[PDB]
Structures are given as structure tokens and as C-alpha cells.
Design a protein around this ligand. Structure first.
Ligand SMILES: *[C@@H]1O[C@H](CO)[C@@H](O[C@@H]2O[C@H](CO)[C@@H](O[C@@H]3O[C@H](CO[C@H]4O[C@H](CO)[C@@H](O)[C@H](O[C@H]5O[C@H](CO)[C@@H](O)[C@H](O)[C@@H]5O)[C@@H]4O)[C@@H](O)[C@H](O[C@H]4O[C@H](CO)[C@@H](O)[C@H](O)[C@@H]4O)[C@@H]3O)[C@H](O)[C@H]2NC(C)=O)[C@H](O)[C@H]1NC(C)=O
Ligand SMILES: *[C@@H]1O[C@H](CO)[C@@H](O[C@@H]2O[C@H](CO)[C@@H](O[C@@H]3O[C@H](CO[C@H]4O[C@H](CO)[C@@H](O)[C@H](O[C@H]5O[C@H](CO)[C@@H](O)[C@H](O)[C@@H]5O)[C@@H]4O)[C@@H](O)[C@H](O[C@H]4O[C@H](CO)[C@@H](O)[C@H](O)[C@@H]4O)[C@@H]3O)[C@H](O)[C@H]2NC(C)=O)[C@H](O)[C@H]1NC(C)=O
Ligand SMILES: [Cl-]
Ligand SMILES: [Cl-]
Lengths: 295, 295
């Protein structure tokens, strides 16, 4: 057993059918040594005595908050969390991996050093999350607090609630090549179940620019000119942070164009265009569409 | 002759004792072709006629503003500047080089990409300055407007007025090694004299941190502890952007200490400390001093 925060301990337990639980000792933060009794918020009545309580922890009813008591007064408390281990493998039950069997998916709309990471939960109940830089050589990152998103991700015939966190690399270098990845670790808590997850990535690999903006269209000799602009969130200056665009007619039959304008032949329909980093093949934006109509 | 801005041209002239001036043609921005006369703000009365004025420019009285005139109305103007060339060498007369025979000295208190460049003038009269990135591969820089500083630099038995400009690298990388220098060009104008100057530097080489702050002192078994803190302007985090300090008793007999505190034996006097980048030998701060007295 090890301490996670003050008066909160993680007990690693093996859930193979009949495996012996862990014997843990809880000592009461008190000077007294006589008439000390213990209680648990998972059980009813005195379940132990003495200043040091020894118990066998194997199932979740053994976890929770253990409280001290002497002469009718409560003296101290301690909280136990279980980190499950089955078939020799840490449990991955709080989060549901994405389609590619990964648990944390992160995204950046530019090279600012800002990015958002997301994960899916199997049950949105009594959750506590904490994400931070795994190592601090390392690219230090500052992360906000996780938030529940209105967007439910559908997998199988599943609708999962999604949590996302936005972070910022403390000191950034948008231009130079990244030679060390950003390393993060997520701690997940559900009631008294403890899990943790990790990921490592380069910003250049998780790039996903916003869609082109102000997609206008003008008529010419039919032939039609479609033009757009770089999204406002994209890194500046555009001369260095240059993008490419795919234009089609209705990760990432649409043809490539490098300028912010291109000729085409629509005459009735919606014309859509996406963007991508010009010199690196990261992810492409969502489609920006506008009706194809002129006078 | 070449155009600097609209209706302002630079004429390169040789000032070797008796060298032939340059023949320049000034054409009047008018449809008319008859009864066109010319005047100069350096001379009195009509000094030319015709829609195209041909003149020999060798001295500064030949420069200035030439004005068109027809039937009593002024039609157009053109302004001439001279870029002096003597003994086969461009003139360096508006600015006075620093002690090391350079003209532009720049300084940065951190790796933010912000820095200030300064130069000295021989005569603070009718001056116009403009500084910009020489090439725009290149580290683009945005510069404010030059300003006269109260600090007069004394050289020889000289007291020179100093001009300084503050600029910012548009996109910075404080951590990675600089492999290309920042290249700037200063244009200097004094009345109708034109000159320009250039410099190239790495930020790491022009680093000059601010002095240590809150230099406190406490007594111990005599022996005295002096402690300080990193300046607020220094790059963060200090764990990466680490400094060293020299401590002495009263570019950069004072001994080195790496922590922000050190023991010493003063008992009466001022104790001074300076700072320097820990892993690179740039310039050292100005001394931060405080009286050495305790109770
Ligand atoms: C993701 O999840 C994994 C799995 O849960 C995490 O791995 C665990 O991390 C913790 C914290 O880093 C590790 O804890 C440490 O364990 C060492 C070694 O302990 C041993 O030797 C001691 C010798 O005296 C002995 O007393 C210890 O006994 C206790 O534990 C055993 C079971 O391990 C139990 O049977 C006994 O009854 C005791 O209860 C033990 O045998 C320990 O030395 C560490 O503690 C010192 O240092 C820390 C940090 O300075 C300090 O806080 C302590 O107070 C103490 O001073 C610490 O407890 C644990 O071993 C990891 N588990 C595994 C399997 O490796 C992982 O960290 C998570 N990652 C992220 C990013 O969240
Ligand atoms: C620092 O200071 C130095 C010295 O002053 C600067 O160097 C000068 O920079 C300017 C601007 O870049 C240079 O000007 C250019 O000159 C070329 C070549 O001109 C020649 O060939 C022409 C062929 O038709 C000919 O007509 C020209 O004739 C004129 O000039 C000669 C004297 O040179 C004169 O005798 C004639 O009577 C004419 O008046 C000339 O022989 C020219 O082609 C350039 O112009 C075109 O392109 C520019 C930019 O697109 C455009 O603005 C023009 O309208 C034109 O379309 C331009 O005029 C000059 O040559 C440099 N001097 C030297 C010695 O190299 C330097 O730039 C400064 N640096 C900084 C950072 O400030
Ligand atoms: Cl990822
Ligand atoms: Cl310099």
C-alpha cells in the first residue's frame, strides 16, 4: 500500500478468482492507546479495535473510509482505494478505449503549445480525474480541470460520455523540430476504484487545424471561383505555417490546391473544402461548406 | 539614383576632392509640357525649366526638395537625399561607433525574443531613423519607434546622445539552440544626408540579465548569510533557465556561488552580487548592492 494524498492510500489487489488479499495496517493518529475502536463506511458496527488495525483487503467492501473512535469521540480517519489487477494485468474499466484501442486522444489546432486531451467513461458516476506531465529534460505542461462534453461518442451501439482537458506547454518552440514527446499521465478514480493511464505524443502528430473561413464564391466565364482564408486559430505567420487544402463537391475524390482560391464547375450544390499542414501530413480539418450559387 | 519612398530619392555621390557629380533627371508629375519651371528649397529663384529637369548633383546644396511650377501653380515635388562615398567607402557620420568600433549595440534581459538596440548620434538634430529585419529562412522581428534616452554615453571627452529601439522576435524558441542570427538594418537620415547600418547577432550572445532582487542579510555564528532571488524579468522556469552569481565586497576579486544564498564575512560595508547565465557566458548584470548591517 502507498499514499496518494494525505489519509488516502492505494491498495493493489489481485482479482484472480481465489487469490489471497493484502494485509494492511491502519494506525490511528492519536496519542491514546486504550479503548480504540474502528468503523467503516462500507459496514455496520465496530469492525476492529486497537490503535493499529490489521485487516485483509480483497474486495471493494473492504475499502472506503476507516474511522477511529475512543470513548465516543472520532479521533482520525483513513481512506483506502483499490487498484485492481487481474490475470497479471492492471484493470482498465473506468475508461473505454477509442476505436484504435487507445484511451487518451489529444488534439491541437496550431503549434501554440496548447492542446486538448479527451477520454471516454463507461459510467459517468462519482468520478475524479487528474492529468499532469508524467516527468518533470521534460516538456512541462500545465493542465486545466477536466470537463464533461456535450458530445457523446458512439462506439459499437454505445453512446459514451466524453471528458476533455485543455493544457499548455509552459515554454514552447513552434518552429524547431520536436525531438522529445510530451508525456502525460491520467489518474482516474471511481468511488473507491483507482486506475491510471498514460500517453506520449508529438504536437506535430496531433495537429488538426480549424476549417477554412469565409468561403466565398464568385462567377466567371460555367466556371466558378471558390476562395477562403486561413482559420484565425492557425499559427502565424502563414508564410511559414503554410497549409494545403482539398476541395470536393457534394484522420482526414477531392483534389489538392495550395492557394486560398481555386476554379471549379459546380452550378448547383454545396462546395466543401478542408485544410491540412502543407509540409507535414497531420490530420485534416472538418469540412467548411457553403452553397454554390451565384447571380 | 533609386527611390526610397514616393517622391524621395537617394543619390549616391562621390566626395573625393574633385570627382564628377551624378547627372539626375527629375520629371514633373503633370500632363502639361509648356512653361514649366523648377525651384529648390536650397536656392533662390527659377533654377530650371522643362517638364524634365536635368542637373548635376555633387554637394548638399544640390539636394533637398525640387518643386514644379507652371503659370504660378505648383504641380509636383521631388526630394533628393545624398548617400556620401569618400575614398571608396560609404560615410559613417550620423552615428558614432561604440568603444569597439561597432555602431549598433543590442541587449536582451531574457530569452523572450524581446531585445533593445541602441546607437549614438554625433548631432541630435533633424534625425529620422528606421530599423527592421534585413531579410524576410529569416527570423522576422517587429520593432517599435526609436526614442531618445536620458543616458548620455561618454567617450573620449565626449557626451553622446543615445537612441534606442525595442523589438520582439515574432515567433520565438527560447529553449532550442539558435542556428541563424537575427539580422537588422538601420536607415539613418540627417536633413538630406542618407546612411544605413547593419548588425547580426544571436540572442544568447547579447543576454544581460537584470540584477538579483531583494538582497536580504541575516546574522549567524562573525558570519553573515546573504540571500537574493532571480530577477522577475528573467526567463522561466528557473530550473531550466538557471543563473550563476558573483559575490564581492566593497561585459561583466569576487567568488562564484550557484545558489541564491551564500555565507560571507563583512561586518561593516556594502555587499554586492551580480548574475549571469549559468551554462553560457553572456554578459553579467549590474551589481545589486545593500548595506551589510545586522542586529
Ligand atoms: C500507476 O499505478 C501504479 C500501480 O498502482 C503505480 O505504481 C505504484 O506507485 C507507488 C508510488 O510511486 C509505488 O509505491 C512505493 O513503493 C516503494 C516500495 O515499497 C516497498 O519496500 C518497503 C521497504 O521498507 C516496504 O515497507 C513497502 O511495503 C508496503 O507496500 C507493500 C506492497 O508494495 C505492502 O505489502 C506492505 O505492507 C507495505 O504497505 C514496499 O514493500 C516505497 O518505498 C515507496 O515509498 C517511499 O517513498 C514514497 C515517495 O517518496 C513516499 O511517499 C513513501 O512515504 C515512502 O517514503 C512507495 O510507497 C508502488 O510500488 C507502485 N506500484 C508498483 C506495482 O510498482 C504508479 O505509480 C502509477 N503511476 C502514476 C503516474 O500515477
Ligand atoms: C544601404 O545603402 C546602399 C547604398 O546606398 C543601398 O544600395 C542601394 O540600394 C538600391 C535599392 O535596392 C539599389 O537600387 C537599384 O538599382 C538597380 C540597378 O540600377 C541600374 O540599372 C538600370 C537599368 O535600366 C538603370 O536604369 C539604373 O540607372 C539609375 O541608377 C544609376 C546609378 O545606379 C543612375 O546613374 C541612372 O541615371 C539611373 O538613375 C541603374 O544603373 C535598379 O534596377 C533597381 O530598381 C528597380 O527595382 C526596384 C526594386 O524593385 C524598384 O523600386 C525600381 O523602381 C526599379 O524597378 C534599384 O533602383 C542601389 O543600386 C544600391 N546601391 C548599390 C551601390 O548597390 C542599400 O540598398 C542600402 N541597404 C539598406 C538595407 O537600406
Ligand atoms: Cl495521443
Ligand atoms: Cl550587437
Amino acid at each position: 500500500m502507498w499514499e496518494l494524498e494525505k489519509d488516502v492510500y492505494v491498495v493493489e489487489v489481485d482479482w484472480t478468482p481465489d487469490a489471497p488479499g493484502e494485509t494492511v495496517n491502519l494506525t490511528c493518529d492519536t496519542p491514546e492507546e486504550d479503548d480504540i475502536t474502528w468503523t467503516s463506511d462500507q459496514r455496520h458496527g465496530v469492525i476492529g479495535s486497537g490503535k493499529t488495525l490489521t485487516i485483509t483487503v480483497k474486495e471493494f467492501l473492504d475499502a472506503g473510509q476507516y474511522t477511529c473512535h475512543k470513548g465516543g469521540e472520532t479521533l482520525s480517519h483513513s481512506h483506502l482505494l483499490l487498484h485492481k489487477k487481474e490475470n497479471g494485468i492492471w484493470s482498465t474499466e473506468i475508461l473505454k478505449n477509442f476505436k484504435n484501442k487507445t484511451f487518451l486522444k489529444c488534439e491541437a489546432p496550431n503549434y501554440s503549445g496548447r492542446f486538448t486531451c479527451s477520454w471516454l467513461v463507461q459510467r459517468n458516476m462519482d468520478l475524479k480525474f487528474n492529468i499532469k506531465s508524467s516527468s518533470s529534460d521534460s516538456r512541462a505542461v500545465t493542465c486545466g480541470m477536466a470537463s464533461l462534453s456535450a458530445e457523446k461518442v458512439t462506439l459499437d451501439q454505445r453512446d459514451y460520455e466524453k471528458y476533455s482537458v485543455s493544457c499548455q506547454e509552459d515554454v514552447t518552440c513552434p518552429t524547431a523540430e520536436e525531438t522529445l514527446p510530451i508525456e502525460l499521465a491520467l489518474e482516474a478514480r471511481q468511488q473507491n476504484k483507482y486506475e491510471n493511464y498514460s500517453t506520449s505524443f508529438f504536437i506535430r502528430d496531433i495537429i488538426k487545424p480549424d476549417p477554412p473561413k469565409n468561403l466565398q464564391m464568385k462567377p466567371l466565364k460555367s466556371q466558378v471561383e471558390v476562395s477562403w482564408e486561413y482559420p484565425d486559430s492557425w499559427s502565424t505567420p502563414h508564410s511559414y505555417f503554410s497549409l494545403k487544402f482539398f476541395v470536393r463537391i457534394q484522420g482526414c475524390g477531392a483534389f489538392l490546391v495550395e492557394k486560398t482560391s481555386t476554379e471549379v464547375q459546380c452550378k448547383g450544390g454545396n462546395v466543401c473544402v478542408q485544410a491540412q499542414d502543407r509540409y507535414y501530413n497531420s490530420s485534416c480539418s472538418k469540412w467548411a461548406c457553403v452553397p454554390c450559387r451565384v447571380r
